[PDB]
Design a protein around this ligand. Structure first.
Ligand code: FMA
Ligand code: FMA
Ligand code: FMA
Ligand code: FMA
Lengths: 231, 231
């Protein structure tokens, strides 16, 4: 409730970045391995696949409901699909490809709508979806995440790709460790400190890096909690 | 006696019919509180929404995963898929709508594939999805459950509502508590007692039976456990 739960997510696509169709998955099976045996704190896994047109037999967009464990959430996909969520008090799951700016404009309607329906959402915690990529070398990390995406937008019809693939990244989480930690736990802030994270560590090719950037942070939260009043 | 597990699923479609627009969603939310608020045996939830053509520009059908907490699953969408799932020796989620005859011919296919990749399968809990209807007057349910499906049916293209949707209902759980129970138990045996349940109590409108069937199960199972010791 000040205590930040952590989850993991994966996109669902064919041959992300460069990785050969079989490889993308073995990596993702490893990402899950850690979860089970080499960590704790990663307590839920998600599967971003939202780039899809979800409409019934009447060209009617379905209600993006995200399920995490017993809990149920709804993707803050728009101003209408977000307003509505206020109505029933449901928490939102912030998109990954949302320039932090614009995605901030949406927890805004969600404070404004909550108001409207005179709803009391002080205990509703949003979920933030970030694409981590940690490499002591500033720049390798960014040119690596610009491959997980550049593929991803082959599918989605992107106008951005005229002037924006850098911002998404700039919005996402990358660089050395400390600047990664100090960036998110900075961003939490711009979200009135009301979010939990679903962070994709799949741009990261060097498995050993990834396994190390995972159990590090585990051993970090597991402590931060322990250390001072959590569980 | 290995400790069997239970989740809860929800179907996802609009203007159900019989249940007006925000009728369903308002019941849905009531299921949800049952879980959070008065139960302890419902570990996860799910929002089935199968009837889609998870295609893309390239027309490649997307890997139909399903996630239940920190664990990954592969929906028995077909015979290949199951086979593919056989490799990674990932569990399967048998779906509420395939006729028990196909939620079996399919399980059969898995095990063929699996012990044909050397992937040990012993300890692999699969997951059964069934709609439920409970009320002493074991004839009611079938009507209010026949309804739901009859209210959904249209899209999917079921090899039967041009005959009747009596197989599907036959496959799911209609009748009366005391009975129903004994019957799914009877269904677990058809899969070497290594299948877990995902129960969607959303056929039954009277929300009092709902909260009762539910809390009825709960206690009854957490009692069982506290007994033969497993919690
Ligand atoms: C490595 C690749 C990318 C990783 C990205 C995600 C990593 C997880 C983030 C770790 C959190 C970290 C703690 C850790 O290092 O152990 C961490 C860091 C590094 C920093 C700089 C600040 C953190 C913080 N963690 C928390 C936290 O867990 N809970 C919290 O309430 N505040 C935290 N804060 C500050 C909050 O803003 C503030 O303390 C809180 O709102 C108190 O409220 P008020 O001011 O209103 O009284
Ligand atoms: C936990 C499981 C939940 C239960 C599942 C059974 C079905 C529940 C249905 C809940 C309906 C509810 C409607 C309510 O009561 O008013 C409801 C909810 C709770 C939410 C979050 C969204 C709804 C929605 N209902 C509708 C709807 O009825 N019709 C519609 O066209 N869009 C609806 N949407 C929104 C779509 O996002 C939108 O159509 C699409 O994004 C197009 O807009 P744009 O692109 O511009 O964003
Ligand atoms: C009311 C709405 C509909 C509800 C439908 C979903 C829930 C249905 C109830 C099923 C759970 C129930 C739990 C309970 O007892 O409280 C339940 C029922 C009703 C019945 C009839 C049998 C149960 C059973 N539950 C378990 C169980 O949790 N674990 C177990 O190992 N065996 C259980 N069994 C027996 C196994 O089949 C048995 O272990 C095996 O056949 C023998 O193994 P071996 O070959 O090694 O010797
Ligand atoms: C947990 C994170 C997600 C993983 C990352 C996303 C990338 C792919 C992950 C799994 C890889 C794998 C490929 C492999 O190992 O060779 C893989 C898996 C595990 C699964 C379950 C399905 C795959 C699949 N790979 C491919 C593929 O490369 N190409 C393709 O055309 N279809 C692929 N499919 C689709 C099926 O083969 C089939 O076309 C369809 O599902 C049949 O459904 P229906 O007939 O019922 O509609």
């Amino acid at each position: 409730m000040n205590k930040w739960n952590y989850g993991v997510f994966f996109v669902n696509f064919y041959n992300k970045g460069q990785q050969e169709p079989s490889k993308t998955m073995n990596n993702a099976l490893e990402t899950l391995r850690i979860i089970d045996e080499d960590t704790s704190i990663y307590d839920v896994i998600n599967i971003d696949d939202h780039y899809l047109v979800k409409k019934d037999s009447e060209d009617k967009k379905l209600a993006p409901f995200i399920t995490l464990g017993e809990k149920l959430y709804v993707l803050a996909t728009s101003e209408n699909t977000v307003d509505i969520a206020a109505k029933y008090a449901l928490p939102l799951v912030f998109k990954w490809d949302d320039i932090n700016e614009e995605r901030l404009k949406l927890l805004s309607f969600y404070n404004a709508s909550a108001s409207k329906y005179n709803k009391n959402i002080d205990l509703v915690r949003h979920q933030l979806m970030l694409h981590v990529n940690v490499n002591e070398a500033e720049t390798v990390a960014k040119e690596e995440l610009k491959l997980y995406i550049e593929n991803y937008v082959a599918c989605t019809q992107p106008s951005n790709f005229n002037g924006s693939i850098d911002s998404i990244i700039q919005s996402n989480v990358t660089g050395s460790y400390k600047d990664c930690l100090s960036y998110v736990a900075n961003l939490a802030g711009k979200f009135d400190n009301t979010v939990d994270f679903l962070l994709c560590f799949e741009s990261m090719q060097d498995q050993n890096k990834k396994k190390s950037v995972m159990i590090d942070l585990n051993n970090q939260v597991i402590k931060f909690r322990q250390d001072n009043n959590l569980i």
